[PDB]
Amino acid sequence: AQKTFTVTADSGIHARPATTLVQAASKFDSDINLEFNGKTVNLKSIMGVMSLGIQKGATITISAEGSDEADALAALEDTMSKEGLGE
């Protein structure tokens, strides 16, 4: 149903690194989401991510839900760590 992460990229999740995941997340077929400090927006959206201002530090949480969850949690885990993000 998901994972959990600790943002490692010192320029958080902004720049393309941002337009990067909104991307992957765009793909799939599940009800992805980003869980950062209480708050949490579908990951399949840009604003929401960008709006949460997710710097280098915190614990983040992936949120996969629907016929192709698992696959995302993995195209993505593999995705952000690939791009110097959480881990």
């Binding site: 393309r16 941002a18 765009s26 840009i46 604003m47 709006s51 201002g53």
Partner: protein, 275 residues
């Protein structure tokens, strides 16, 4: 009718700030398949006001406009505009036109006060264009408010405003430090008018944060290529691009817009011009 092409009128894309702003725009307007018709504004009321018209003539389903001062009238032609306009990293009182940008008052404020607790007495401001409602009504605003609110002499000449250059960033630190009463610290908007200031006092012999505790704005790559590395305000030049278009897009693709006026997050990135 709708041409899948969104113009944009940005000042000078030689400018790094505005640069990373394209990417901002370019990069989403692609995800959402619209060719962006870039067009340099060179900050000038006719260069602006005209150039627009065309975005309109050569039919473009929207327009993310930018200025360092989106003027009274400006809004009018803007309110008028038959196509959606989404002011980016620019500002104008009325909220009448959507507008994605960062919180320019408080950000100014924070560093100022977050200088003062660094056991700080006599602070200072060094911003550019005191005309730009983006400056005089904002970064000074905050420069002043956190300042007053913690009883301090808001010395109307502790603030000088060179353009947006490095050269002037050093040249301001000079004429400000020519003064009898020397500053325990300094604020600055232009990310590179920070280097303008660090290698500024550092040229008349003065260590940082040793002699002066400096800070600034943007955090853009330029905030690493210096010794000390520069401690400054974080604003997402690109991110503003991003959430700008996504927003115009939301308007161009009849989607339900939440807030017509946004202000993405901002934090402090202390490198070394602060202890």
């Amino acid at each position: 009718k709708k041409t899948t092409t969104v113009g944009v009128i940005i000042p000078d894309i030689s400018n790094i700030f505005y640069a990373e702003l394209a990417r901002g725009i370019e990069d989403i307007a692609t995800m959402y398949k619209y060719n962006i018709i870039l067009s340099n504004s060179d900050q000038n009321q006719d260069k602006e006001l005209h150039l627009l018209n065309n975005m309109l003539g050569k039919q473009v389903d929207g327009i993310i406009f930018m200025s360092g001062n989106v003027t009274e009238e400006h809004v009018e032609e803007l309110k008028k505009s038959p196509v959606p306009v989404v002011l980016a990293a620019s500002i104008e009182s009325t909220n009448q036109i959507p507008s994605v940008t960062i919180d320019y008052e408080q950000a100014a404020f924070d560093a100022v006060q977050s200088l003062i607790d660094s056991g700080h007495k006599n602070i200072a401001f060094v911003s550019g264009t005191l005309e730009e409602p983006i400056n005089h009504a904002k970064k000074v605003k905050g420069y002043k408010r956190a300042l007053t609110e913690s009883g301090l002499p808001v010395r109307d000449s502790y603030i000088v405003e060179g353009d947006y250059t490095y050269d002037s960033g050093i040249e301001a630190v000079e004429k400000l430090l020519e003064e009898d009463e020397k500053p325990t610290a300094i604020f600055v908007g232009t990310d590179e008018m920070a280097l303008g200031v660090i290698h500024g006092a550092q040229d008349r012999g003065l260590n940082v944060p040793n002699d002066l505790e400096i800070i600034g704005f943007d955090n853009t790559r330029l905030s690493t290529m210096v010794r000390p590395q520069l401690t400054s305000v974080v604003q997402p030049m690109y991110d503003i691009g991003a959430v700008a278009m996504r927003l115009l897009t939301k308007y161009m693709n009849k989607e339900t817009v939440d807030s017509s006026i946004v202000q993405l997050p901002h934090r402090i990135e202390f490198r070394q011009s602060t202890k």
